[PDB]
C-alpha cells in the first residue's frame, strides 16, 4: 500500500485533503490518501522545468536505456502490479496479470526502440548555396492526465512516448485509481534524473486545474471524457498549449449476411464486455444486416447470458464490477433510458446485481434505431445494442454519422466489401473479422469528438516533438 | 474589381453588410464589398460537406493534377495578381511580382508532388495471423483563416495542403485584403468540383465566428494574432476541432563577435523591414555581442536610414506602408513606449511619415534590455531593436526565455558555435549567417504561443490527414 | 525518321556499323541506323561525367522543373510517339496511344514531385556534443539499358528517377526498337544542360559492353533477360559497380474454388495476352483449384479464341505480332516443348500465323504440371498454361518454388485467404482479384532471379542515391 | 577456448582440415580448429532454409525479443569476449573492453528496437477502387562473411540486421580470427530456433566459395578486400544474388589554415593508428593546406612517435600488432614503395619492430603527392601520409578523384566552408573537426569501389528486406 507523491526524485505525502479510495468488488474503502496541495502541483511543475535543461539534451540512446530499465522494473513486479490493479479496479486478476501486464512492459520496450528511430527529411541544398536539415526537439514539460479504466496502462501510454522524446512529465492519475501509479512512483524513483518524472494524486478541480494551467506546462495529454477534453482545451487556450486527446468512442460493429455468425458472437461476448465494457474500443454498437439479425440476436443473447461474475481473485471470473458507485448509476440510467423508448428489447441483463461492489448485469439490447441515445452516446458499461440494416451504403453512412471516431470493425467474408468498408469508415482503427486487438507498433487514436493524436506507434512519439528547420548559409 | 464570393461552384454577391477595402499607400477606398451572410456561411460549409463524399475518395494523382492546374492559372495571371496585392497591401510592385508570385506558384506545384508521396508504416503481421496496414485519410471540411500581411500567399499555404490531403475548404481572407482571394475565386471556379473550394469575404465576428463554429467543420487553420488564436481554440472547444496555428513570432537575431558585420547589416536592412516588417519571421530583435555592439548599431543605423519609401508602383521603392490606420497606430504606440523607458535611443526613424497613406519611418532602436516590451512583444512594423550581450550561454537563455517560438537566426563564423546554438534554440526555424529564407520543401511553424502545425513541406500535408490502422484477421 | 545520337547536347550520326530496324507487323525494314562507334560511347560517358559537376549540385526544385517540362513535351508529342512505337513494335495503335502514352507522361510528373520529397533520419545529437545529419546525394554517371518490349516506357522508367536524383545518364535502347528513343533524343536535346542526358544506338556487344564497362560509369540499370543480367553483373564486378536489375518473371495466377470465374477469364484474356504476352508481369502460369479447373479451362479457351489479330493501326486489333523473327522462333519452340511432354493439351492456338511479320496465335495450354518447363520458365509470348491444385498450402509452396519473384495474383472472394496468400507469396507484387495494374506511386521490382531495385515510387528514386552521414563536432 | 561450429541448434566439431590460429602479439599458436566440410556447409544452408519457413513469419516483437536476449548474453560475458578478442587480434585489452564491447551490445539493442519501426508508403487507393499497401518481407537465407579487423563487432553488424529483418543466417568469420565467433556460437546456441543462426569456421576458398555459391542463399554480405568483393560478385552472378558490400576506404583528412592544429594532431594520433590502422575509417590520408603544412607535420610527427607498443593486456599499451605475418609483410612493402618514390620523407617510424609478433612502428610520411600509391591505395597499417594543398576547390577535386568512398573528414573553423566541403565530398560519411565516431543510429557504408549498402541504422535493416506491393481490387 504505497501512498506518497513523487516530486523531484523524492517520495512525499500529499499535504492536501484526504480522499477515499474504493474496492469496487466490495464497495469498501481501501485507504484514504491526501491530495497534492496547490504548492505541491507548482513544485512538481517547477522541478520538471528545471530538470528539462539537462534531460532535453540527452541522446536517444540514454533515454532508450532509461525506458528499458523502467520496463524491467515493471516486469519484475508484475504480480504486485496486477494485484493492486485488480483490488483498485475489480479487474479479474487473471485478466490483469495475463493481458495487461505483458502489454504495459512491451509499450515501454517499444518506445525505447522507437526513441532511436525518428524519421526526418533528407538534408541538402533545397536553396542554392544553403544546407537545410530537419530536427525533432522535445517541448518541455508535459501534463499527463490518466483515466480510471486502465490506470497503469494509460500511465505507460503517457509516460513512455513523452520521455522517449526528451520531455519531463508530471502525471496525475485518476483519483478513483491511483494505487498502481503510486506504486510505480516508488519503484521508478531513481531510474530517471530528479524531476524528469513526477507523479501526483487528486481530483480534476483541485489538482488537475492548477496542473494543466501552469505557464511552464507546454503540452497537456488526456484520456477521459469529452466534457473533460472540452474543459482542458478552453482552460489552456490562453497559452496555445499543445493538446493531445483521446476522448472515447462508440465502435460500430458492422455485421453483413456473409459473416461467420459464431465468430461474431464469440468476439462480442469478449469485446462487448471485457473490463465490464469500460473500454474506449468496446464492441458496443452492432449494425447487423436483416438476413442474419434474428439469428445473431438469439445467439448473442445466449452467449452473453453465461458471462460469469464473481470475486476478481477467482479464476472463473470473466466479468468484474463497474469502477464506482456513480458510474454504476450512470450505466444503469442509460439502459433505463433505452428501455423507455418502447422499441428497445432487453434480450438479457439490464439490471444492477445484488450485493455490495458495483456489479451490473451483462446486457444485450435489440431493436435500437440509428437516432437512439443508446446508439449515439457512449455507455462505457457491460451493455451491447443491436440495430438492423438493409445495405452497405446505408450502414456506412450510419456508422460515419457519429461524433465519435476512435475504433470500429466490419465482419464479412467478401474481400472486396471488407476493403470498401475499411477505406470508407471515419475511425482511427478498423478491424476486419475481429475487434479489440492492439499492438504497440500500430497507432491508437481518434478523429472528430474522439480527439486527435496517437498513442502507441512512432506517431505516438512524434506527437511529443517539435519539428525544426535549420538552414546554414555557405 | 472582382467582388463575388465562390460558393458551391458559383460566383455570388455577399448578402450581408457592405465594408470598405482601402489602398494603404494613399489612404483611399478601393471599393466596398458585401460580406457573406450568416446563411451563405452555412451554405458554403454545407456545399463543402456534400462535396467531400466524392472528393475525399479521389486518388492522389487526380488531386495533384488539379493542383498543377491551379498553379498554372496563378502563373498565367501573375502580373494581375501582383498588381492587386500591391494596390491592396502597399507592397512594392517589383517585390510582389518578383518574390511573391513565383513562390506562390511553386507552393502549389510542390504540394501537387507531395500529394503522391505520403509516408506510412510497413504493412504486415505485427500480431500473428493478422495483417495490419496504415492509411492517411482526409478530415472533411477545413475552415481556413488568412491574415492581411501576405494575402494570396497565405491563401495558398492554407489551400494547397488541405486539398492535396483530400479535404474540402472554406476560406476566409482578411476583411482588410480580400482582393487576390476574390480574383482567385473567379479564376479557379471550375478547376475543382463544385463545393471543394469556397471563398467568402467578411470580418471575424460576423463571418469567421459562424464559420469556425459550424458543426460540419472538422479543422480550423489560422495564421493571425495570439488573441485571435486563443479565441478560436475557445470557440471550437465544444467539438474538439483540430486546430492548426501560426500566431506570429519575435525572431531573435543573435550576432557574435566573429560575425561578418557588413553581411549582418545587409541582411537585417532587408529582413527587418521587408514588407514594412509585417512578417512573422521579421529580423526584429537583435542580440549583439559586446565586442561588436556599437559598430553594428553604427553601420545598421546608416543602412536603415537609406531605405526608400515611395509609390508602390515605382521600381526604386523599398519600403511600402503599413496595412491599416489602426495598425499604424499600434506600431507608433509601441515605439513611443520604448522611448518612454528612459534607456532606449532612437538611432533612426521613430516617426510617422507626413502625407496620406499609412507610412512609418524605417526605425532602429538601441539600448533595448531583455525585459523590455520592445524585446518581448511583436511590433509587426518597420522597427528593429538592439540589445548587447556578454556570453553564449546568457544570450541563448535570453532568446529561449520568450513566449514566441517561430523563427530565429545566429551569426557567427565558428562551426562549433553555430551548431551548438542551433541545437539549443527553441524556435521552429533557425538560420545561420542569413535570415528569412523559405523553400517549399522545408516546414515553417512554431512552438509555445507561436502555435503548432507546419505550413509547407511534407509535414504541412500530414497535418490535414488522419492516420488510420486497418487490421485484417487471417 | 529520326536517327541521330544525342551526345553532350548535340544530335549526331553514329559512326559505327549500320544495323536494320524492322516493322514486325510486316517484316519490312523501316530503316538502317548507324551504331555509336566505340569513340562515341567514350565521348558520351565523358560528357555525362563533365556535366555531373554542376548537375549533381542542382536543387530538387530545378530538377523537378526540368522533369515537368520533359513530361509536357512527351504529352505534346503523344500521337507521334504512339505511331513510332506502334510501327516499330506492332503494338495496336489504340493501345499504345491510350494506355502507354498517359503512363509515360505520368511517370515523369510523379518523379518531378518525388524529387522534392526525399526522406531521411531526424538530424540531432546521437552522440553528446555532435550534430549528425543524413543526406541523399547522386552517384554520378548512370548507364541505362532498355528492352524491346516497352521501349519508350522503359526509357522513362530509367531516365526519370536517375535525373530526379541528380545523376547524368547515358541511355541505350534495344537495337531492335530505338525509334521512340531517338525521337526522344531530338525532342529533349535542350531541356537539360548538355551532357546531362545522352542517348546512343547499338547492339549489346558493340555498344552495351563499352558503355557498362566504362570506368566513370557508377551505376548500371538493366531491364532484360537473366543471361544479360548475369553478364552485366560479371562484366562490372571489377569496379563494384551499383547494379539495378529487372530480369523478367513467371507470374503465378492462383485461382481458388470461390473465385469469380468470369472475372478471372476476362482478366487473363487481357493480361495473359496484352502486348502479345511480352511483358514481365503477364498472367502466364495459372494454378486452378480442383473444384473449378475444368470450368476455368473451358471458359478461358473460348475467350482466348476471340482475340483479334490484324493491322496495328486498326481499332479492332487486340493482338499484335511478336518483336522479331528470333523471338517468334523462341516462343514457337517453347510451345512444341510443352506438347512433346505428352500430357499438355492445346485448348486453342499453338501455331505461327500465316504470312510475313511475326504473328503467333493466342495460346491456351491445359494439363501443365508443376515441374514442366512451360510452368517453370518464362515464355514471354501469347501463351498461358493451366495446372490443377488441391489445397492452399500446396499451391503457395508451388508458386514459391520458382526462380522468379516479380509479380503474381490470387483470386478468391475470402478475405482471410486473400491476406494469408498475399502475405506469403515471394513476389515483388501480388494483386488480389485482378492482375497487371500499375501506378507511378507503387514500386515494381523483383527478388531471386527477377532481380532487385524498384521502378516507380519513392523507392525507385532512392535507388539512384547514396545516403551520407555528416557529423559536426560542437 | 571453444572450437565447435553452431549448425541447426547443435555445437559440432568441424570435419574438414585443421587450421592454426595465431596470437599476433607473440606468434604463438593459440590452437588448431577444424574447418567445416563441404557437407557441413551444405547442412548449415539447409538448416537455415528449413528454419526460414517459420522464422520468416514471426512478428517484429518476437525477433526483437530474441535480439535483446542475445545483447544480454554478450553483455554478461563482456570480460571474456574482450579477452578472446585481445588474444586473437592483439587489440589492447582496455580498448577492446571499454570501446568495442559496449558498442557491440548496443548494436543488438539498437536493431531490436529498429525491427519494430519499419517505414512504408501510406496504404490506400492510388488507382480508383483498388487498395494498395506496401510490406517489407525477409529474403530467406543470408551468407555473412566477417573480416579479421573487428571480428565480433563485424559479426554483430552482419547478424543483427539480417535477423531483425526475419532472415536466417550462416556466418563465416575470418579463418584468422574465429575465437569470439565460436564463443558466441556456444553462448547463442539456444537463443534463436534451430537453424536460424549458424556459425562455421574456415578459409575463403574451402568454406566461403561453397557457402556463397549455394542455391538456397539469397543474399551475400561481405566486409573485406576489393578483390574478395569482386570475386563474390562474379561467383554469385549466375543467380543474381543480392550483395551487400563494405570493401574499405582511404579516408581523406582535409585540414585548412584555420583548423585547430592541436586538435587535428590529438585526433589523428588516435584515429590514424587505433587498431594498428587496420580500420576502414582510419585517418590515413592528410591533405594539409600550405599555410599550416610544416607546423602540422612537425607536431604530428612528435605526437605519433610517443605511441606506446607493448603487451595487449597492459593498461599503458596504445598500439598492438598487425593481424598476421602476411599483413605485416604487405604494410612494410607499401612503406618501402613510398620511400623509393624519391620525394617522401619518413617523419617517424617506417620499420618493423624487433621481436616476434607482427608489430610495425607508428609511421608518418610527408610530402606524398596526389598520384602516389601511398595516397591512392589503402594501406591498413599504422601509417599516415601528408599532402600539401593550395585551395578548397583543388583539394575537394583531389579528395573526390579516388576509387574509394567510405569515410572522410574536414577540419576548419569556418561554418560556410565546413558545410560546402561536406556537401561536396563523395564519401559515405564526413566528420567536421573530428573523425572516426560511429553510433548505432547512423549508417556506415560506401560508394564507388568501397561498395554499397549500409551497416547500422534503419538503412542497414532495410537492406535485408524486399519491399512488396499488395493491391486488392474492390
Ligand atoms: N478513458 C476513460 O476513462 C474514458 C472515460 N470516459 C467517460 O468519462 C465519463 C464521466 O467522467 P469520468 O468518466 O469519471 O472521466 P473523466 O474525464 O472525468 O476523468 C479522466 C481524467 O481526467 C481528470 N480530470 C477531470 N477534470 C479535470 C480537470 N478539470 N483538469 C485536469 N484533469 C481533469 C480526472 O481526474 C481523470 O484523471 C464516464 O462516462 C466515462 O465513460 C470517456 C472516454 C474515456
Ligand atoms: N500573421 C501573423 O502571425 C500575425 C500576427 N499579428 C499580430 O496581431 C495583430 C493583427 O491584426 P487583426 O486584424 O486585429 O487580427 P488578426 O491579425 O488575427 O487577423 C487574422 C485573421 O483572423 C480573422 N479573425 C479575427 N477574429 C476572428 C474570429 N473571432 N473568428 C474567426 N476569424 C477571426 C481576421 O478576420 C483575419 O482574417 C498585429 O498587431 C500583430 O502584432 C498580426 C497579423 C498577423
Ligand atoms: N551482336 C549480337 O549478335 C548480339 C547477340 N545477343 C544475343 O541475341 C539475343 C539478344 O536478344 P535480347 O533479348 O535483345 O537480349 P536482352 O533481351 O536481355 O536485351 C535487353 C537489353 O540488353 C542489352 N544488352 C544485351 N547484351 C548486353 C551487354 N553485353 N552489355 C550491355 N547491354 C546489353 C540489349 O542490347 C538490350 O538493350 C540473346 O539471345 C543474346 O544471346 C546479344 C547481344 C548482341
mmCIF file of N, CA and C and ligand atoms in Angstrom, chain C residues 145-148 172-175 202-205 208-209 212 222-225 228 231-232 330, ligand 3:
data_model
loop_
_atom_site.group_PDB
_atom_site.id
_atom_site.type_symbol
_atom_site.label_atom_id
_atom_site.label_comp_id
_atom_site.label_asym_id
_atom_site.label_seq_id
_atom_site.Cartn_x
_atom_site.Cartn_y
_atom_site.Cartn_z
ATOM 1 N N UNK C 145 20.052 0.627 -69.660
ATOM 2 C CA UNK C 145 19.816 -0.337 -70.724
ATOM 3 C C UNK C 145 18.356 -0.744 -70.818
ATOM 4 N N UNK C 146 17.726 -0.358 -71.919
ATOM 5 C CA UNK C 146 16.322 -0.636 -72.084
ATOM 6 C C UNK C 146 16.055 -1.821 -73.022
ATOM 7 N N UNK C 147 14.950 -2.513 -72.748
ATOM 8 C CA UNK C 147 14.494 -3.669 -73.530
ATOM 9 C C UNK C 147 13.557 -3.328 -74.704
ATOM 10 N N UNK C 148 13.261 -4.324 -75.544
ATOM 11 C CA UNK C 148 12.393 -4.096 -76.687
ATOM 12 C C UNK C 148 10.868 -4.211 -76.400
ATOM 13 N N UNK C 172 21.035 3.471 -73.520
ATOM 14 C CA UNK C 172 20.991 2.596 -74.673
ATOM 15 C C UNK C 172 19.669 1.813 -74.810
ATOM 16 N N UNK C 173 18.868 2.131 -75.822
ATOM 17 C CA UNK C 173 17.668 1.369 -76.160
ATOM 18 C C UNK C 173 18.032 0.036 -76.746
ATOM 19 N N UNK C 174 17.097 -0.901 -76.745
ATOM 20 C CA UNK C 174 17.298 -2.087 -77.575
ATOM 21 C C UNK C 174 17.611 -1.639 -79.017
ATOM 22 N N UNK C 175 18.582 -2.290 -79.651
ATOM 23 C CA UNK C 175 18.850 -2.112 -81.069
ATOM 24 C C UNK C 175 17.649 -2.487 -81.981
ATOM 25 N N UNK C 202 22.668 0.994 -80.571
ATOM 26 C CA UNK C 202 23.502 -0.138 -80.953
ATOM 27 C C UNK C 202 23.335 -1.425 -80.167
ATOM 28 N N UNK C 203 23.901 -2.508 -80.668
ATOM 29 C CA UNK C 203 23.762 -3.801 -80.017
ATOM 30 C C UNK C 203 24.451 -3.906 -78.632
ATOM 31 N N UNK C 204 24.117 -4.980 -77.929
ATOM 32 C CA UNK C 204 24.747 -5.336 -76.661
ATOM 33 C C UNK C 204 26.278 -5.423 -76.675
ATOM 34 N N UNK C 205 26.834 -6.173 -77.614
ATOM 35 C CA UNK C 205 28.297 -6.437 -77.682
ATOM 36 C C UNK C 205 29.163 -5.273 -78.182
ATOM 37 N N UNK C 208 26.749 -1.945 -75.755
ATOM 38 C CA UNK C 208 26.448 -2.112 -74.358
ATOM 39 C C UNK C 208 27.681 -2.359 -73.520
ATOM 40 N N UNK C 209 28.477 -3.353 -73.932
ATOM 41 C CA UNK C 209 29.763 -3.710 -73.307
ATOM 42 C C UNK C 209 30.744 -2.526 -73.044
ATOM 43 N N UNK C 212 28.729 -0.117 -70.334
ATOM 44 C CA UNK C 212 28.563 -0.543 -68.943
ATOM 45 C C UNK C 212 29.889 -0.767 -68.268
ATOM 46 N N UNK C 222 19.459 -2.149 -65.734
ATOM 47 C CA UNK C 222 19.043 -3.049 -66.800
ATOM 48 C C UNK C 222 17.653 -3.618 -66.577
ATOM 49 N N UNK C 223 16.784 -3.501 -67.597
ATOM 50 C CA UNK C 223 15.639 -4.398 -67.690
ATOM 51 C C UNK C 223 15.889 -5.269 -68.927
ATOM 52 N N UNK C 224 15.893 -6.587 -68.776
ATOM 53 C CA UNK C 224 16.089 -7.520 -69.899
ATOM 54 C C UNK C 224 16.111 -8.971 -69.419
ATOM 55 N N UNK C 225 16.845 -9.873 -70.072
ATOM 56 C CA UNK C 225 16.833 -11.291 -69.653
ATOM 57 C C UNK C 225 17.752 -11.605 -68.468
ATOM 58 N N UNK C 228 21.530 -11.587 -69.697
ATOM 59 C CA UNK C 228 22.123 -10.251 -69.845
ATOM 60 C C UNK C 228 22.435 -9.699 -68.444
ATOM 61 N N UNK C 231 25.477 -11.376 -67.199
ATOM 62 C CA UNK C 231 26.682 -10.940 -67.938
ATOM 63 C C UNK C 231 27.151 -9.556 -67.477
ATOM 64 N N UNK C 232 26.177 -8.640 -67.317
ATOM 65 C CA UNK C 232 26.461 -7.299 -66.855
ATOM 66 C C UNK C 232 27.051 -7.383 -65.438
ATOM 67 N N UNK C 330 11.601 -18.696 -80.826
ATOM 68 C CA UNK C 330 11.774 -18.994 -79.395
ATOM 69 C C UNK C 330 10.454 -19.409 -78.739
HETATM 70 N N1 LIG E 3 25.684 -8.722 -81.661
HETATM 71 C C1 LIG E 3 24.957 -9.808 -81.377
HETATM 72 O O1 LIG E 3 24.833 -10.888 -82.313
HETATM 73 C C2 LIG E 3 24.300 -9.905 -80.015
HETATM 74 C C3 LIG E 3 23.561 -11.049 -79.698
HETATM 75 N N2 LIG E 3 22.950 -11.211 -78.473
HETATM 76 C C4 LIG E 3 22.167 -12.483 -78.298
HETATM 77 O O2 LIG E 3 20.941 -12.266 -79.007
HETATM 78 C C5 LIG E 3 19.848 -12.214 -78.134
HETATM 79 C C6 LIG E 3 19.754 -10.775 -77.682
HETATM 80 O O3 LIG E 3 18.382 -10.590 -77.536
HETATM 81 P P1 LIG E 3 17.793 -9.640 -76.411
HETATM 82 O O4 LIG E 3 16.631 -10.494 -75.959
HETATM 83 O O5 LIG E 3 17.725 -8.249 -77.022
HETATM 84 O O6 LIG E 3 18.845 -9.545 -75.130
HETATM 85 P P2 LIG E 3 18.074 -8.907 -73.929
HETATM 86 O O7 LIG E 3 16.662 -9.339 -74.128
HETATM 87 O O8 LIG E 3 18.467 -9.087 -72.394
HETATM 88 O O9 LIG E 3 18.068 -7.336 -74.277
HETATM 89 C C7 LIG E 3 17.856 -6.359 -73.266
HETATM 90 C C8 LIG E 3 18.779 -5.168 -73.490
HETATM 91 O O10 LIG E 3 20.028 -5.619 -73.028
HETATM 92 C C9 LIG E 3 21.028 -5.150 -73.925
HETATM 93 N N3 LIG E 3 22.267 -5.883 -73.806
HETATM 94 C C10 LIG E 3 22.428 -7.168 -74.265
HETATM 95 N N4 LIG E 3 23.703 -7.586 -74.012
HETATM 96 C C11 LIG E 3 24.383 -6.535 -73.419
HETATM 97 C C12 LIG E 3 25.697 -6.439 -72.975
HETATM 98 N N5 LIG E 3 26.539 -7.470 -73.121
HETATM 99 N N6 LIG E 3 26.110 -5.270 -72.373
HETATM 100 C C13 LIG E 3 25.198 -4.209 -72.238
HETATM 101 N N7 LIG E 3 23.895 -4.295 -72.703
HETATM 102 C C14 LIG E 3 23.479 -5.461 -73.263
HETATM 103 C C15 LIG E 3 20.372 -5.323 -75.296
HETATM 104 O O11 LIG E 3 21.110 -4.668 -76.350
HETATM 105 C C16 LIG E 3 19.021 -4.734 -74.956
HETATM 106 O O12 LIG E 3 19.162 -3.332 -74.938
HETATM 107 C C17 LIG E 3 20.234 -13.079 -76.957
HETATM 108 O O13 LIG E 3 19.824 -14.398 -77.259
HETATM 109 C C18 LIG E 3 21.752 -12.933 -76.881
HETATM 110 O O14 LIG E 3 22.339 -14.177 -76.542
HETATM 111 C C19 LIG E 3 23.038 -10.191 -77.541
HETATM 112 C C20 LIG E 3 23.777 -9.031 -77.826
HETATM 113 C C21 LIG E 3 24.405 -8.873 -79.061
#
